[PDB]
């Protein structure tokens, strides 16, 4: 289960970080070079099978990674995300067994790499599927292995946010930014070359007379992005940073020093649910992957419990889909909080052993009553911290102010944690 | 079978008040600073705009 495949599968690993340990800004150089790569990585593929729909999970899938039928990114980071998530599941869920020797744990990372790259190959094969099938597979793994190396050289390396989450964040900055300035529009019944940019809604004032119907197209634009959409997008950003500052303060007499009070906080984000939203996303991405196997042996009847109902009309033609979608979103993020905290740290025993491990004792009572001091917050500030993100992403879909929904809420949550990481080194 | 619902709904209204949840200065700081951090990752799309469609013209034309 672990003792056999892991010792053989060691093929082509990564090099661990050097002895140039403490530094300020060459850290940021190792970030920025990867950001040059994902300038570059979102670029066009070499095969001319020009299929009509770009990707099938293109919207939710697009929210995770937006190079749908596109570049070496690849319709999503959905390989790395889904493969990371179920790996951490099957490590945490004891369907598969804990390694804490630096070896089995090293080959555990190796098998992590193994299933990750195999799943990249699987996604490559399943998106490209004529007779032109050569060399797509070679490209994808090469570009799967590259994202692998860039992520694991930004965990033991620079890594502050992750490799992963800041990729998602910057690609989400771009997906707002193509909506920010928009050069092309294929010409509709009138009005070429203006699609939901503010330049579009400044060139639109230069072309057309009757500025009332220049305002109306600027603020109630439907098929292209909208500027009412951009107001709602800004509004969501403001509210979410209103809710990041929700934190619980706990003052601490440090042990053996008179009265320094570096109060440990607990923000409601509970890791900003980068599990829990992507928990909400990637299960509804894996079926819209595997509806392709439903065409033979679907985008219709399976969709009614699969996706949001996409309509600005709140009383659109099915309340079943709306109710089940919102209830699944709320329950999914809450449930994956109350299951998530037990693995990636900051559960009750986690906090207790870190504070004893860094000599910080609550004033009110004895050291190992600190558990019972703080066990009455963390699960609820997991669960509610799960729940009122997903319902929040309901408000990202119910009203169209997001350059995008759930995913935009959560990639800016990446940014918000990201600011903390950068600030850390001051 | 009904009471854990009561437990969690009262449990929420506990920890809402224990939080700080201040004004706008925090909000101001992460607001402006992280829209700036967004657009740091953002104009990159305008540079794959400026590059990878005209070099795709180079690709298909030759």
């Amino acid at each position: 289960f672990l003792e056999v495949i892991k010792p053989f599968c060691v093929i082509l690993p990564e090099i661990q970080k050097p002895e140039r340990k403490i530094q300020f800004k060459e850290k940021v150089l190792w970030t920025a070079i990867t950001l040059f790569i994902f300038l570059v990585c979102c670029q066009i593929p070499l095969f001319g099978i020009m299929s009509s729909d770009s990707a099938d999970p293109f919207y939710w899938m697009r929210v995770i990674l937006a190079s749908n039928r596109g570049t070496l990114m690849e319709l999503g980071i959905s390989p790395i995300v889904t493969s990371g998530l179920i790996m951490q599941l099957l490590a945490g869920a004891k369907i598969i067994e804990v390694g804490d020797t630096p070896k089995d744990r090293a080959l555990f990372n190796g098998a992590q790499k193994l299933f990750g790259m195999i799943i990249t190959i699987g996604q490559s094969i399943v998106y490209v599927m004529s007779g032109i099938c050569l060399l797509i597979t070679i490209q994808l793994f090469v570009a799967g292995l590259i994202v692998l190396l860039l992520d694991e050289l930004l965990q033991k390396g620079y890594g502050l946010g992750s490799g992963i989450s800041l990729f998602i964040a910057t690609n989400i900055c771009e997906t707002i930014v193509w909506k920010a300035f928009s050069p092309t529009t294929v010409n509709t019944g009138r009005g070429m070359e203006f699609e939901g940019a503010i330049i579009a809604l400044f060139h639109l004032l230069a072309t057309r007379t009757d500025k009332v119907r220049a305002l109306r197209e600027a603020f109630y634009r439907q098929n292209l992005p909208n500027l009412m959409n951009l107001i709602a997008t800004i509004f969501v950003f403001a509210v979410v940073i209103y809710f990041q500052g929700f934190r619980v303060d706990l003052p601490i007499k440090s042990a053996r020093y008179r009265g320094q009070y570096n109060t440990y906080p607990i923000k409601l984000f509970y890791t900003s649910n980068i599990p829990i939203i992507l928990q909400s996303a990637l299960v509804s991405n894996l079926y819209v992957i595997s509806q392709m196997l439903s065409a033979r042996f679907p985008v219709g009847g399976l969709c009614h419990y699969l996706s949001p109902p996409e309509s600005f009309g709140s009383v659109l033609e099915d309340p079943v889909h709306a109710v089940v979608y919102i209830v699944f979103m709320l329950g999914s993020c809450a449930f994956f909080s109350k299951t998530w905290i037990e693995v990636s740290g900051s559960s009750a025993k986690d906090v207790a052993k870190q504070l004893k491990e860094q000599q910080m004792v609550m004033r009110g009572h004895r050291e190992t009553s600190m558990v019972h001091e703080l066990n009455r917050y963390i699960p609820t500030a997991a669960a509610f911290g799960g729940l009122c993100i997903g319902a929040l992403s309901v408000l990202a879909d119910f009203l169209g102010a997001i350059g995008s929904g759930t995913g935009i809420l959560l990639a800016v949550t990446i940014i918000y944690q990201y600011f903390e990481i950068f600030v850390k080194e001051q | 079978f009904v009471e854990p619902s009561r437990q969690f709904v009262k449990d929420s209204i506990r920890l809402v008040k224990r939080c700080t949840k201040p004004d706008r200065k925090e909000f101001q700081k992460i607001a402006m600073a992280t829209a700036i951090g967004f657009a740091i990752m953002g104009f990159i799309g305008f540079f794959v705009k400026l590059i990878h469609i005209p070099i795709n013209n180079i690709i298909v034309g030759g």
Binding site: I15, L46, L149 | -
Partner: peptide, 29 residues
């Protein structure tokens, strides 16, 4: 990454894609 070639390796891979993309497109137009 005791060494930085893995990165350089990735850069080489993009170049191989970068150059080899337009390299066949040289004979076409």
């Amino acid at each position: 990454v005791g060494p930085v070639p893995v990165l350089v390796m990735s850069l080489l891979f993009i170049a191989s894609v970068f150059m080899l993309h337009i390299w066949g497109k040289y004979t076409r137009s």
